[PDB]
Structure 1
Amino acid sequence: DFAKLAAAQGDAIDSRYHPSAAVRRQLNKVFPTHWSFLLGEIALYSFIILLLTGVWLTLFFDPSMAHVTYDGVYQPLRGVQMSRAYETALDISFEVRGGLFVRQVHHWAALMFAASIMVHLARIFFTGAFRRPREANWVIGSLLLILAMFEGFFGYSLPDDLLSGTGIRAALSGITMGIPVIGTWMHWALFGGDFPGEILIPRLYALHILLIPGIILALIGAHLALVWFQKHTQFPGPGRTETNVVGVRVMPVFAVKSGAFFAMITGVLGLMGGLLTINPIWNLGPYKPSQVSAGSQPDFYMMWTDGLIRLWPAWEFYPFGHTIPQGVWVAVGMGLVFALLIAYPFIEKKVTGDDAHHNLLQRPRDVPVRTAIGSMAIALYLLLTFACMNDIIALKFHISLNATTWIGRIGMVVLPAIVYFVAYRWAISLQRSDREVLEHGVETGIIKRLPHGAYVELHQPLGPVDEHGHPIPLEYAGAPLPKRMNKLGSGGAPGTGSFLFPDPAVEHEALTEAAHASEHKSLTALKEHQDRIHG
């Protein structure tokens, strides 16, 4: 008797505890159903996978630089001195069943975590979800993104590897040593000595499995709590206002689709972990200060750092008996970058002056200046990222390495300007397309007028029609407009039988007029709610 058991357990829970009010309150919470709002979920989902994979990896990884001979299965590295960390990474790849798969999906999940964070940040930036109600969210999210990047760096740096080892040498050692006042001191504190210090990998392990994931989890808890209680923002629409959330309640619909999206994201990550090779460390011998590779890139989320190193023209300064290495520059760069990312909503509200409680999102086209700024930032990020890959780009695409370096050098100043101009004009053009469709209506096939040979596109008004042919123009309300009759109720009733065979005409009828009635009732209900809001 499962129904009776469920009732009894509910009564026990509500008799010991009293969550009925609270449980109902969240089960009834409405979440907007825009696809873009799922972007952030991806990151969360990816994050979860990382945790689930990370713990597994912790059961088989020994962080240390204790030199050891492999003496393991992988023949091409036998008797070769390697840190215990590299030996255990090799053991996970080869010695433990599924270990290659587990660490592969872990690294793919790290990459997806980074990429989905970037996509979510772009979404919220261009849609203006960071305004008055939710700057703090932005801020923590920015911090969150930063942490992710660094943890990723500490992730592929954990298995002491030639690629990851040279990445540590460049970034941590060189840049930290370059910092003027305390740079050498910070370097000696982080490594407990010079670069090959014997307490680096254990410290990175502690930072990467315990500290940074814990901080990220706390910040994600804060993020999701704010989004939950600062109820999600929404795009402008028919019944959508600054004082309501139009969508689907949590329990019936939103929870099911969120869980299904987590399942499908996990499936994508598993398929990648199987079919795609990520960080094949065995090909990468154990780290040695002398051995090198030509590629020598970090994961894509630090490629912008590496490209900024490459493109910055070797500018150093030499004070009284002191050196300020060019590496210093990148540190300042990151500062500014982060200092501008974390603080952006406050600069936006200081310049624009928008200090109002904004709950309705803004289409990126409706904010040409911010859309242009974000496109410029994305262009600079892409330029830096590809500059980090200028070695490989030159190798595969035959372009001289100096030519690629100088293309990046001139680009980091020119390409942002061109992209800003183009994005500004593009946003204004999208606005004008919206205005044109409002004032004329959707476009269709051409007809030749009866008496003469006039050719007219035979538009479709979206609103009331004037006494004559042309309609009354509608007022833009910040919502997307249909540029294709395709997406209206035109030519959209295929036979509902099957792909191969039909269903009886009575069944097809029943179904099609039922769907027509349902969608008309949806439209009518939204319109009636809209009118009831004001009227």
Structure 2
Amino acid sequence: MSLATVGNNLDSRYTMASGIRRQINKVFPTHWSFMLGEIALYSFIVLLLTGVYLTLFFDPSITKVIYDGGYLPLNGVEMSRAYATALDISFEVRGGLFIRQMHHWAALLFVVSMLVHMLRIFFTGAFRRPREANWIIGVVLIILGMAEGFMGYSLPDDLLSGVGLRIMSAIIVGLPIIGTWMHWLIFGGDFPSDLMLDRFYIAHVLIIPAILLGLIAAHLALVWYQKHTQFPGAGRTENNVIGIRIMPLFAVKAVAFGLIVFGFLALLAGVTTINAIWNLGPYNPSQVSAGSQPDVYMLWTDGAARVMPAWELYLGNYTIPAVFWVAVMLGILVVLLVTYPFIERKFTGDDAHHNLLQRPRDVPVRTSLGVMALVFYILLTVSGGNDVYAMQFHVSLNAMTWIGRIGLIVGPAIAYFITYRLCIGLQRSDREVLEHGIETGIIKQMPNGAFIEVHQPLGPVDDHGHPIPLPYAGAAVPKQMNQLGYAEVETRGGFFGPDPEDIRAKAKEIEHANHIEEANTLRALNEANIERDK
């Protein structure tokens, strides 16, 4: 076939035969955690493309028009050109509503996917040496992704977006030397300003996407260069990777998971409404709603402003407003996240070149601090959303603010305590299995009447008839007998009937032969590791 001619013509010119061989043969581990990041990547792809489709219709201008579009309930209402063009996307373009909702849902999925991916990186310990650079890059990404998404939903100039813009401007003006100067620099004047929405539009469609794309490219390139970490397991060492090659069996799975995420987004974009701007009306600074919170990924920085106890300083001709302290708090919160691996180094007392991951149970301090930060962030989030929470679940609004205040101290401590003790209990169960074997659950009575539970050893048994303890290795310990194969089906066939018996027996024989062959190869690989380590 002419495919060989194409390949020949390519390689005779570019000599890629050595390199692409090395690329296709790279090995990637197959844990389920290790494609959370791919979700964020796929969401970013969708964010790009749907965004580019929205720009052929959106007009980022704060100057007014008397609306005369397809949405009849606002004919004659004087509105910003931004809001009018967003409405024309929603109503006058075939399927523009579908697209706009997909863009928004993709933004939410993108941010939460980054959050969960970062949680995996934090708990499993993958940020450690040499990979802390990917942490410093990645934290910047999850900051900018929020910064972008915020100004992304600020653009339509509806009533719910402009209040968040008002909040941002009023926070900037309050800074204790340069606030007025920084505000006049950013907005080009007092708020609302003529040049405001175009600066934010270009910041949203060109600048921050360009930076995110560059940083994501560098991130993935670094992950590819220094190969992926892995969990401890049979035959795994600090100096090797066990998994599947990037093709055929991994690239197709990446394509398939891309398809799944893509289609999931296209479903939820048509089936759930998001940001129904047409019933919010255009922005004017005199109007506000009871539930006027920012997007979900910004609710934490709303909740901070809700829980600060109004401490304000007056110094003669000057004043530090009460909102400077939430800026300090949120900055400290961001600094701690940004610089984490080094404050981990200074107290952990090690600088080793780790390539194997820690199970979160085996590192109770870090996982306890992670759950502590999770409850802190969640209390900030729900305090941001407490207006809705109190309205729906009928808890007094003052009680919600005080729950946020006192909880941001107390609840983290309770989280740390419970998380630490639970982790210790988990690893105690692991040791109990490794030194006594699995508890099958089969209870038998001896002739003496003693009730005994037969335990099924994993390692060899002493001549007294009891297991010899194994050393814990960091790999997961099986805790039941269905996880050793002992509940697998003996019958073969589909629904409504069996396979013929000859096929049945031969298939089961081949299955068991493979099951012992893979055990043998992993066992020999582990023994080779022992020999090669001395």
Structure 1 residue 48 corresponds to structure 2 residue 45: yes
1:520 is matched with which residue? 516
> Which residue, out of 66, 71, 75, partners 1:69?
66
Unaligned runs of 5+ in 1: none
1:79 is matched with which residue? 76
- Residues 446, 455 of structure 1: 8 Å contact kept: no
* SS of equivalent residue, structure 1 residue 534: helix
> Which residue, out of 207, 212, 215, partners 2:208?
212
> Which residue, out of 107, 121, 126, partners 2:123?
126
- Residues 159, 281 of structure 2: 8 Å contact kept: yes
* SS of equivalent residue, structure 2 residue 65: strand
1:464 is matched with which residue? 460
Structure 1 residue 337 corresponds to structure 2 residue 372: no
User: 1:516 & 1:199 partners in 2: Cα distance?
Assistant: 72
User: 2:194 & 2:512 partners in 1: Cα distance?
Assistant: 71
Unaligned runs of 5+ in 2: none
* SS of equivalent residue, structure 1 residue 295: coil
Matching residue's letter, 1:142 = V
User: 1:48 & 1:527 partners in 2: Cα distance?
Assistant: 42
Matching residue's letter, 2:267 = L
**In the TM superposition, what whole-angstrom CA distance separates every residue of 1:332-377 from its partner, at most 9, and x where no partner exists?**
1221122111110111011112201010010011110000000000
Alignment RMSD: 1.2
* SS of equivalent residue, structure 1 residue 247: strand
* SS of equivalent residue, structure 1 residue 314: coil
| Displacement of 1:442 | 1.5
User: 2:357 & 2:67 partners in 1: Cα distance?
Assistant: 57
2:239 is matched with which residue? 243
Matching residue's letter, 1:104 = Q
User: 1:66 & 1:497 partners in 2: Cα distance?
Assistant: 70
User: 2:9 & 2:509 partners in 1: Cα distance?
Assistant: 46
2:140 is matched with which residue? 143
**In the TM superposition, what whole-angstrom CA distance separates every residue of 1:223-274 from its partner, at most 9, and x where no partner exists?**
0011000111111111111111110010111111111111101111111101
> Which residue, out of 156, 166, 170, partners 1:169?
166
1:398 is matched with which residue? 394
> Which residue, out of 250, 257, 260, partners 1:254?
250
User: 1:146 & 1:518 partners in 2: Cα distance?
Assistant: 48
The answer to which of 372-381 and 291-300 deviates more is 291-300
Percent identity, aligned pairs only? 64
Matching residue's letter, 1:73 = G
Structure 1 residue 229 corresponds to structure 2 residue 225: yes
User: 2:452 & 2:67 partners in 1: Cα distance?
Assistant: 78
User: 1:265 & 1:24 partners in 2: Cα distance?
Assistant: 30
User: 2:60 & 2:492 partners in 1: Cα distance?
Assistant: 60
User: 2:53 & 2:238 partners in 1: Cα distance?
Assistant: 45
User: 1:69 & 1:457 partners in 2: Cα distance?
Assistant: 82
- Residues 57, 89 of structure 2: 8 Å contact kept: yes
- Residues 493, 512 of structure 1: 8 Å contact kept: no
1:408 is matched with which residue? 404
Matching residue's letter, 2:4 = A
- Residues 174, 327 of structure 1: 8 Å contact kept: no
1:312 is matched with which residue? 308
Structure 1 residue 364 corresponds to structure 2 residue 360: yes
Matching residue's letter, 2:356 = L
Structure 1 residue 178 corresponds to structure 2 residue 170: no
* SS of equivalent residue, structure 2 residue 466: coil
2:96 is matched with which residue? 99
Structure 1 residue 485 corresponds to structure 2 residue 486: no
User: 1:56 & 1:338 partners in 2: Cα distance?
Assistant: 34
Matching residue's letter, 1:39 = L
- Residues 444, 453 of structure 2: 8 Å contact kept: no
* SS of equivalent residue, structure 1 residue 245: strand
User: 1:453 & 1:144 partners in 2: Cα distance?
Assistant: 65
- Residues 64, 83 of structure 1: 8 Å contact kept: yes
- Pairing 1:397-436 to 2, within 5 Å after superposition: 397-436=393-432
Matching residue's letter, 2:248 = P
User: 2:185 & 2:283 partners in 1: Cα distance?
Assistant: 21
* SS of equivalent residue, structure 1 residue 326: coil
- Pairing 1:295-306 to 2, within 5 Å after superposition: 295-306=291-302
User: 1:320 & 1:452 partners in 2: Cα distance?
Assistant: 90
| Displacement of 1:501 | 2.6
Matching residue's letter, 1:281 = I
| Displacement of 1:393 | 0.6
Question: Larger strand proportion, structure 1 or 2?
Answer: 2
Report the number of matched residues. 531
Q: 1:191 to 1:443 in 2, by over 3 A?
A: same
User: 1:88 & 1:522 partners in 2: Cα distance?
Assistant: 62
Matching residue's letter, 1:173 = S
Q: 1:450 to 1:456 in 2, by over 3 A?
A: closer
User: 1:339 & 1:373 partners in 2: Cα distance?
Assistant: 15
| Displacement of 1:506 | 2.0
**In the TM superposition, what whole-angstrom CA distance separates every residue of 1:79-102 from its partner, at most 9, and x where no partner exists?**
112111111111111111111111
| Displacement of 1:494 | 5.2
